[PDB]
Amino acid sequence: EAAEERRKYQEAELLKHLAEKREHEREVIQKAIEENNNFIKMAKEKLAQKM
Amino acid sequence: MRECISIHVGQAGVQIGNACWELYCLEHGIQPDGQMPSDKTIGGGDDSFNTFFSETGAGKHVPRAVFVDLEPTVIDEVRTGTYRQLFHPEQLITGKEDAANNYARGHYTIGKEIIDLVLDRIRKLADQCTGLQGFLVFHSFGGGTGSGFTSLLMERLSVDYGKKSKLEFSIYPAPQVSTAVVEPYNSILTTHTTLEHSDCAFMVDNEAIYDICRRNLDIERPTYTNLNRLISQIVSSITASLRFDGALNVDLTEFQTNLVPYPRIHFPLATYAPVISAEKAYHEQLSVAEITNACFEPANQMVKCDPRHGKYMACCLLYRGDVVPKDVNAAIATIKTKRSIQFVDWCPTGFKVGINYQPPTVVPGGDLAKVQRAVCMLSNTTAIAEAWARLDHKFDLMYAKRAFVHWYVGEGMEEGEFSEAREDMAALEKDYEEVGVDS
Numbered sequence: 447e448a449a450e451e452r453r454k455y456q457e458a459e460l461l462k463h464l465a466e467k468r469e470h471e472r473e474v475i476q477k478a479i480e481e482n483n484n485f486i487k488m489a490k491e492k493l494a495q496k497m
Numbered sequence: 498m499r500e501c502i503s504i505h506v507g508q509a510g511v512q513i514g515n516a517c518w519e520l521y522c523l524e525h526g527i528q529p530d531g532q533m534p535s536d537k538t539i540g541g542g543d544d545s546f547n548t549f550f551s552e553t554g555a556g557k558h559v560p561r562a563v564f565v566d567l568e569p570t571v572i573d574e575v576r577t578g579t580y581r582q583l584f585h586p587e588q589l590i591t592g593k594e595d596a597a598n599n600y601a602r603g604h605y606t607i608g609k610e611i612i613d614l615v616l617d618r619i620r621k622l623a624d625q626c627t628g629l630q631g632f633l634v635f636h637s638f639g640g641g642t643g644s645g646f647t648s649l650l651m652e653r654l655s656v657d658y659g660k661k662s663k664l665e666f667s668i669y670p671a672p673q674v675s676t677a678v679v680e681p682y683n684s685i686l687t688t689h690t691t692l693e694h695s696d697c698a699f700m701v702d703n704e705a706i707y708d709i710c711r712r713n714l715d716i717e718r719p720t721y722t723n724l725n726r727l728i729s730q731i732v733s734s735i736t737a738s739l740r741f742d743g744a745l746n747v748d749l750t751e752f753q754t755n756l757v758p759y760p761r762i763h764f765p766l767a768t769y770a771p772v773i774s775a776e777k778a779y780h781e782q783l784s785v786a787e788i789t790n791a792c793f794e795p796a797n798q799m800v801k802c803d804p805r806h807g808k809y810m811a812c813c814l815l816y817r818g819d820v821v822p823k824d825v826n827a828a829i830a831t832i833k834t835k836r837s838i839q840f841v842d843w844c845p846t847g848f849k850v851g852i853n854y855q856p857p858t859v860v861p862g863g864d865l866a867k868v869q870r871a872v873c874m875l876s877n878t879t880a881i882a883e884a885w886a887r888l889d890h891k892f893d894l895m896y897a898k899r900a901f902v903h904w905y906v907g908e909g910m911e912e913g914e915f916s917e918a919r920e921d922m923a924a925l926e927k928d929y930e931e932v933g934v935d936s
């Protein structure tokens with residue numbers, strides 16, 4: 447049982463590492479969304495101001 | 498009559514177990530459907546062959562045997578083989594995925610899952626025994642199952658059958674016969690874990706069997722079948738005394754009494770002769786003196802080593818065929834004056850001799866020719882420690898770099914168990930040196 451528990455601890459560390467990967471994946475794509483939207487908003491505001 | 502249960506674990510133990518029971522049936526005149534015309538007590542009896550076979554009302558003689566492998570492909574060749582009818586389903590036990598050459602996976606990860614089942618099926622055989630002597634366990638040192646699961650089973654057998662004897666037939670790894678690169682690890686791990694649970698262990702080195710197959714059968718590249726049929730001959734020589742009338746090694750306790758003065762030094766060397774090619778038309782029949790002399794030739798030993806550079810604790814000569822005591826003692830007297838045969842000082846310099854008049858049986862169509870006499874010598878000599886030193890050295894090379902260790906720790910094994918195991922083998926090597934060498 448102590449060896450079984452050691453296997454379980456190591457799997458849990460693993461799934462926790464992969465969970466950190468999934469949140470980084472989420473941060474990357476929401477960063478891309480945020481920057482495309484800020485480009486569009488910036489361009490819209492500069493155009494309005496210059497017109 | 499007292500019963501013996503045979504247990505075959507992993508690929509090597511199962512495939513060797515197949516060969517032995519095939520041989521046992523031939524030796525006893527038991528047909529592949531389990532019928533035995535010679536047996537006139539239908540559905541019962543306490544003859545000597547009943548130590549290894551029980552009987553059904555239908556007259557079928559059933560091996561007191563269990564086959565266990567964590568993968569189904571090898572045992573499936575028993576289910577569908579030539580003796581399908583001999584065994585019943587409950588005796589063949591297969592898991593789903595094997596131990597991947599990994600002692601820790603066979604012992605901890607998969608072993609946990611399957612041990613209770615295996616023990617339950619063995620219990621069904623023990624319940625049919627009026628007076629169980631104990632177990633004969635066939636396995637490789639090197640496989641993940643043969644090493645890892647065998648050691649777990651032997652521990653649990655000492656629990657559930659504390660008063661029973663346990664004998665091993667262990668296949669010692671040799672690169673000539675496909676080995677995993679981690680077999681040194683597995684070998685040391687399982688010897689450490691099994692040492693105090695086994696009463697007597699016969700090591701068979703695949704290198705020795707392989708070379709005998711090349712040299713004496715002139716098979717250029719021997720198969721597992723070639724290897725296992727020779728091994729089964731030697732096994733049958735060792736177990737004959739349990740299955741036939743006689744007065745030497747008639748129960749498992751006598752093996753320990755006659756071969757093992759010191760419980761840890763319980764690995765007798767087996768030497769077998771003669772091994773004769775069956776495609777060799779006309780061959781002179783070797784005499785008692787010659788086959789007995791061949792028992793002191795390292796080329797005939799089950800483990801290659803040099804008994805001249807060690808000391809004997811015990812020696813049994815097991816003859817099959819046309820042999821009388823007169824010829825044995827003549828041959829022994831001659832051999833004592835020409836060979837280098839040193840016993841330890843605290844032990845009698847002598848030989849226990851057993852003769853069964855029936856000459857060895859060979860498998861029809863096999864590569865071994867019938868002979869009119871053969872002998873298996875079982876000697877407890879310190880020279881077998883050379884096999885431990887060799888294995889221990891390979892273990893050290895790899896462990897110094899922790900090579901492959903992560904496979905074992907990943908299955909829940911602590912690195913410390915490697916050091917535990919290796920230190921036990923170090924004591925073992927020094928026990929042998931104390932007993933058999935002088936400064």
Ligand SMILES: Nc1nc2c(ncn2[C@@H]2O[C@H](COP(=O)(O)OP(=O)(O)OP(=O)(O)O)[C@@H](O)[C@H]2O)c(=O)[nH]1
Binds near residue numbers: 508512639
């Ligand atoms: N003499 C002999 N040796 C065998 C046989 N099969 C395998 N071996 C040897 O046994 C060792 C490998 O262990 P195996 O018994 O095949 O493996 P296993 O116990 O089934 O364990 P895993 O497959 O790892 O689960 C190697 O040293 C092989 O050379 C056999 O039929 N006869």
Ligand SMILES: [Ca+2]
Binds near residue numbers: 537538539540543
């Ligand atoms: Ca009978």
Ligand SMILES: [Mg+2]
Binds near residue numbers: 640
């Ligand atoms: Mg296997």
Ligand SMILES: [Mg+2]
Binds near residue numbers: 498500626628
């Ligand atoms: Mg009985």
